[PDB]
């Protein structure tokens, strides 16, 4: 059916519009991504010049379709049975002793092109503290996130806590409470309680002068005995 879209290598589109605390900016991103293995490679850049918050803080705002479900799990991969048409990705990621974010997000196909398309506004963060004063290093730990069902909506949802490290040694807290629902009316699977387990690798490319992020990320389903 779905599944079938993220058999072989599928090219991706990243566009987010976002504001906090006013500062306006833009990102885009395209790459590719393999839901076999799990794996996804990008390159981000900043459209509109400086980006004015650290780069990890958005790891997770910018396809979950591409996650890695073993297949004694296929039966719990909502994101999957979406396609082609798509779902609506919310959250908001409140950051510990500072402002938050609140995102709103539709991924679909575009003919081949698997697409993420982002609005983003932040709300009440410190002009001195760790997101605007941009103080969290450049890299981003490994994180597993349980996914539960949501009948009333027809779709699912996930609390679960993003860590930052600051540059001083601190870490940086990020509540992060997601809800996916349909685009389509299609069938959707809805899934037991389960994780997801992600790792990211941030770099740099050498000969790109602007502002941007490289990145390598897996994600892999587990859970379900």
């Given at each position: ?62 396809v979950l379709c591409f996650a ?9 991969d909502f994101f999957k ?6 779902y609506?990705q ?17 991924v ?39 996914i ?8 699912i ?23 996916n ?15 997801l ?22 994600v892999?389903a587990?859970?379900?005995?």
């Open positions: 059916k779905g599944e079938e879209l993220f058999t072989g290598v599928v090219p991706i589109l990243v566009e987010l519009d976002g504001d906090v605390n006013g500062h306006k900016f833009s990102v885009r991103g395209e790459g590719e991504g393999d839901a076999t293995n799990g794996k996804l490679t990008l390159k981000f850049i900043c459209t509109t010049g400086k980006l004015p918050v650290p780069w990890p803080t958005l790891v997770t705002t910018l890695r479900y073993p297949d004694h799990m296929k039966q719990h049975s979406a396609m082609p048409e798509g609506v919310e959250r908001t990621i409140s950051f510990k002793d500072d402002g938050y974010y609140k995102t709103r997000a539709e679909k196909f575009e003919g081949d092109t698997l697409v993420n398309r982002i609005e983003l506004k932040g709300i009440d963060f410190k002009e001195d503290g760790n997101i605007l004063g941009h103080k969290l290093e450049y890299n981003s730990n490994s994180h597993n996130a349980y539960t069902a949501d009948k009333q909506k027809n779709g949802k996930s609390n679960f806590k993003i860590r930052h490290n600051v540059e001083d040694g601190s870490v940086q807290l990020a509540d992060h409470y997601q809800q629902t349909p685009i389509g009316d299609g069938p959707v699977l809805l899934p037991d309680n389960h994780y387990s992600t790792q990211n690798a941030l770099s740099k490319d050498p000969n790109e002068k602007r502002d941007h992020m490289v990145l390598l990320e897996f892999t587990a859970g379900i005995t």
